[PDB]
Amino acid sequence: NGMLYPQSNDSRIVFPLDGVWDFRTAGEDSYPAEWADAPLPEPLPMAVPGSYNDQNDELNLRAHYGWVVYQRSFAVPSRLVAGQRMILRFDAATHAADVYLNGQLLGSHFGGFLPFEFDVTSALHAGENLLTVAVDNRIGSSTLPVGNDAGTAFMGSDNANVPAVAEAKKHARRQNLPNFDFFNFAGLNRHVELYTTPADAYIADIAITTERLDHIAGDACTAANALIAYDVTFGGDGRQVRISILDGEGTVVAGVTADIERTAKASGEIAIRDAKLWNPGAAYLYTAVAELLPSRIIDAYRQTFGIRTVEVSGTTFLINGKPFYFKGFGKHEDSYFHGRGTDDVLNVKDVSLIHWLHANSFRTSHYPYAESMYDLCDREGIVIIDEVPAVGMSWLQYANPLVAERHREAIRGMIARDKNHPCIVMWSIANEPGLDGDGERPRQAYDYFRPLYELAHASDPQNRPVTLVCCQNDYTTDITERTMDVVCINRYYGWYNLSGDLDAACHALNIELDFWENIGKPVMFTEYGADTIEGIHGTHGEMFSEEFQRDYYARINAEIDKRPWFIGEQLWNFADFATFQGIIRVEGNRKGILTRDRQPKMAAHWLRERWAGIPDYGYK
Amino acid sequence: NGMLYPQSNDSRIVFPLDGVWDFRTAGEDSYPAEWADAPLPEPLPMAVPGSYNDQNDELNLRAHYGWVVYQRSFAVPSRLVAGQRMILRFDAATHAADVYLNGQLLGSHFGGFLPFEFDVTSALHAGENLLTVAVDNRIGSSTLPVGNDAGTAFMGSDNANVPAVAEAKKHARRQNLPNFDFFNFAGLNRHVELYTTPADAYIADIAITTERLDHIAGDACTAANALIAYDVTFGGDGRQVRISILDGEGTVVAGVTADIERTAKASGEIAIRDAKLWNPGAAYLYTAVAELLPSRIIDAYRQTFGIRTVEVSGTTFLINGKPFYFKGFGKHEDSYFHGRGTDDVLNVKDVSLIHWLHANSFRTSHYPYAESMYDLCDREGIVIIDEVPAVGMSWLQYANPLVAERHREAIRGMIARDKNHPCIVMWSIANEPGLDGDGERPRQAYDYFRPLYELAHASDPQNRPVTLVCCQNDYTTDITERTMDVVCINRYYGWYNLSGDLDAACHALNIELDFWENIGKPVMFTEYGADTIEGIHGTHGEMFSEEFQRDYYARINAEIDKRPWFIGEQLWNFADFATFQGIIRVEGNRKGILTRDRQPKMAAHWLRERWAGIPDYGYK
Numbered sequence A, B: 001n002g003m004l005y006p007q008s009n010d011s012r013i014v015f016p017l018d019g020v021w022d023f024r025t026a027g028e029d030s031y032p033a034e035w036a037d038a039p040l041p042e043p044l045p046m047a048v049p050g051s052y053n054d055q056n057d058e059l060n061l062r063a064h065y066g067w068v069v070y071q072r073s074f075a076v077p078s079r080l081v082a083g084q085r086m087i088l089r090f091d092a093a094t095h096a097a098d099v100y101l102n103g104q105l106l107g108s109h110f111g112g113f114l115p116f117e118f119d120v121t122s123a124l125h126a127g128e129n130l131l132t133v134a135v136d137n138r139i140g141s142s143t144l145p146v147g148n149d150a151g152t153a154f155m156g157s158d159n160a161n162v163p164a165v166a167e168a169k170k171h172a173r174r175q176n177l178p179n180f181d182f183f184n185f186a187g188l189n190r191h192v193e194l195y196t197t198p199a200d201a202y203i204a205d206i207a208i209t210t211e212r213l214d215h216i217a218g219d220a221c222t223a224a225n226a227l228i229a230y231d232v233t234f235g236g237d238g239r240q241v242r243i244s245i246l247d248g249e250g251t252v253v254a255g256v257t258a259d260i261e262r263t264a265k266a267s268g269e270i271a272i273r274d275a276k277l278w279n280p281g282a283a284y285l286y287t288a289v290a291e292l293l294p295s296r297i298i299d300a301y302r303q304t305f306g307i308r309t310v311e312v313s314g315t316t317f318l319i320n321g322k323p324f325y326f327k328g329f330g331k332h333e334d335s336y337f338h339g340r341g342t343d344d345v346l347n348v349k350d351v352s353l354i355h356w357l358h359a360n361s362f363r364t365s366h367y368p369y370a371e372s373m374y375d376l377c378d379r380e381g382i383v384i385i386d387e388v389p390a391v392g393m394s395w396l397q398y399a400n401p402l403v404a405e406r407h408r409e410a411i412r413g414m415i416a417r418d419k420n421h422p423c424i425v426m427w428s429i430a431n432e433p434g435l436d437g438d439g440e441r442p443r444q445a446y447d448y449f450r451p452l453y454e455l456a457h458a459s460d461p462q463n464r465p466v467t468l469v470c471c472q473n474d475y476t477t478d479i480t481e482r483t484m485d486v487v488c489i490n491r492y493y494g495w496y497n498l499s500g501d502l503d504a505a506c507h508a509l510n511i512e513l514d515f516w517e518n519i520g521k522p523v524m525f526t527e528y529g530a531d532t533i534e535g536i537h538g539t540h541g542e543m544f545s546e547e548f549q550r551d552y553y554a555r556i557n558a559e560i561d562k563r564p565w566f567i568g569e570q571l572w573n574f575a576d577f578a579t580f581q582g583i584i585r586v587e588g589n590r591k592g593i594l595t596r597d598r599q600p601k602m603a604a605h606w607l608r609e610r611w612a613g614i615p616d617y618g619y620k
């Protein structure tokens, strides 16, 4: 269950396998299994990590349906592998993958946004090894994220009553039809690496939690005392583990030796005097160094953490006991050539833009992001809402046990991967599932989501709040959103309804805000926005102009400022991003306040000035 | 002198150091050297590889002048450094760097586009090591590429006669002023890695050459016999090295054991029957495996190569004895967030676009590119003209001994790094230096460049042709260009002169072609083009419209098709790219046939149709 990111130290080495691999497309429902036995025939080049779809302009890989096959060779010195446990880790293979090493099937994985690994100790050999990875991009009614089995993609146009249309659909080329508003970029989107641990006994998982803060300073920079807890899990086979806590300068400020008891675990607590707390806008990180003891060290792992508490109290959201206000947006992992491929240059740039904007937070819409982005937000003081890929869901999925199992898998996998990040303050278990309606539909949705809400709470040792991001709906028949810890709403008054009429949009919004006022929960936007083409201007801005987007946020934000229980504004979106093609997507989704190349539209400048004047704590 | 790219095998391991480093800006002329003794204070994140300039929008790092400081920590198992020679390699630090490891100054380097390395066997230690790299971006009258010490950047506007301007210049913030038309992106632009070799005796360099081809097939796919030569250099301290030649399937087709003799070298020839030849559009690669013998193997290195000859004969350019015609463009290493940083997703996409366009070649304008791109072009059958960063030069530089030494270093360093690539067919020793004029100026330029032409020929074991890329000039007083092995001219008739008037442009072009007809050398364009804003259209296209760009190539190409001695058309540019800001640069240089996001303008479609109909061999 532990998925610690691979580390190099005196006991462990990581051998990256990124670079230019060989690649072939394969069939809609099959690939040649014999490709794992010999070098691929007539291979294309394909860089890893990256989506494959935009890496070849001779082929139309955005249209590909089904399997592709990656392959490369590697060699490592016998000295590296001797006596060690060898693990091959895939940070992400989107959506499903079959992995072969020297012709041997290691195993398979479903779930395109979370890491998986194999023990390859016995499958490796000396000299060149041949690694073959088949990757399946298909989505449909039983995948997360959800695809449509027929009809159109999300907000696609149709003329379904025309007989010629009905007939042509029967013979059309198969294509994935996302039931979500982003392009189905596929492939080895994140890093691949071989790593080593000791074989006899090794550190398998670490959890650090902030248990209690005593006498927190008025500015929240420190606490007189912080009680933290550790939980180390071991693999392999009167043994001990040394746990050292290092402050920001590398100084060992605390140390304890713990007994390993058997499933091997060491557990306990440490009090840290005058602890420096992690806050939005003012990050501070410690390192917990776990050293497996026999003079010597047997194994070691260095786990970053930050000391801070998160608590929902009434209509407030308390970080280190202070009332926080979210400023930010949903994001995407999306960029020109990379697709959904991880790109740390762009992550570094995006975190700087978050600071330029004076925002303090974002949501990982609509899937867990690459691990490096959370490390970045840890060091940069940016709060994250962490979301599983359960987008596109409705009653057809809730009745499908395979979907429920995939949903539980995603929630457990996300929290197991991400639990140690101080920047994560809240979990999102779905984006815009169907919740409202009549008859038994609202109750069926509730019975589907309530156990998953409980699952997210049971899985997180820090016990952070749990939400479900709600689509614009009939809020009076939805019975599920109002039971979340924070109510997170996506609303497009004046864009998808009351179009262009900001007076009516604000009137409608206030009617719904009156509803939420009586519910008594803290409420925030997680989406609201307007497609905007940079360079479209007007003196009285209409839909798609830069002025309309600016006016949209100016009007809507004036209304939520009047509500003391409205605790955040995350807009849609940070930046324009790719989608399946359709009549409402102009080269993708254009609700970014930045362009796809991260340049600011008029609204971004306005929001920057607004957010410069809103404190992280005490605004409401 | 050897710079073999780091390889992992049974005798050697590579440990990458890329990732998110710590970073601080420093002074115009200094940085704090004590930063190498402890973690940088209050660091920013900075992804490596990548330019730093576009990775932080809070700061204005495009405006930065002087030093910045990078830092990271790393740790490797003692088990794998033990007994080994430990080398730290910087694939590129732009432009100059000081490198510290655990406080100790390892040394410094100046060229910004070529790799350098340090032996750190003795500076490493167990546990965490602290690597600090100060990088200097400054350019001026003594650097390659050349900066201006005062005035404006390349093609900048001025009103120098206005007294207020003259006075304001004296106090203006110091800024790099490129004397070249691309942005001065700086930082750790390419990968950083630590690698190991055996310490007592190791392979230091390998050079493979195609010495002779017997009975080449009519289609140039094979020769009845190919004679290749090897030259292996060793470091360290009756010794022997086994050379195995592997074909595309890994079959050992030829092999020899050579004696090692004292600088420790082994060299010889190998006959390969029915050799499969490397051609544009039809790549074929062999591998030369060199194994240092003591049954055991002491050391090994696998060197890719391709079997082909390059020869200029009269007014033809012969590859494997067939008359080649260049179709392609100058490129840049330039992209949105990365800057000049290497990006293998983008390299893979760009090579696919070269194929989409039916081009067969490019030039590395105006600096050597990342090593991975040449490996890609070797495998994809794309021909390269390899160019050093000697851009922006004029008579001020020719009398500067520091410049001359940097120019010789770049020529030797480029050819030492790149000599084994079959895709490289020609070396370029400068782009658009000053060559014409009256008095002694033409002779001064000739006396500067002729020793460099000879140096390039003496450095390359394959003895490939050498050129210098000529700016639009008075070709009748230039005495240097006409002495190159291939005449490579940059011409902008109808753009920078005779503007908009394609009839006059073609007339002027034909007058100059008449001059070159009498010189009797093979001639090619290395640049010609027209800035073009995608989406600007006209029925009679004017400058900056998509139609003008199409008409420009249509008219110019019709004229060179009439000249049998004109052996190639490389246009400017493959794609729009960033420049220093100025009144003639609309968000950079817009002469790309693709946009900066690699989308095709009208002219790219027209060129694709033209080039589809032009064969690699025998067009003229």
Ligand SMILES: O=C(O)[C@H]1CNC[C@@H](O)[C@@H]1O
Binding pocket: A180, A181, A182, A366, A432, A490, A527, A572, A589, A591
């Ligand atoms: O319609 C939109 O722009 C948004 C609506 N809410 C869900 C988002 O993924 C989607 O992109």
Ligand SMILES: O=C(O)[C@H]1CNC[C@@H](O)[C@@H]1O
Binding pocket: B180, B181, B182, B366, B432, B490, B527, B572, B589, B591
């Ligand atoms: O002016 C231009 O567009 C080009 C002229 N020749 C040199 C190129 O670097 C430059 O970009």
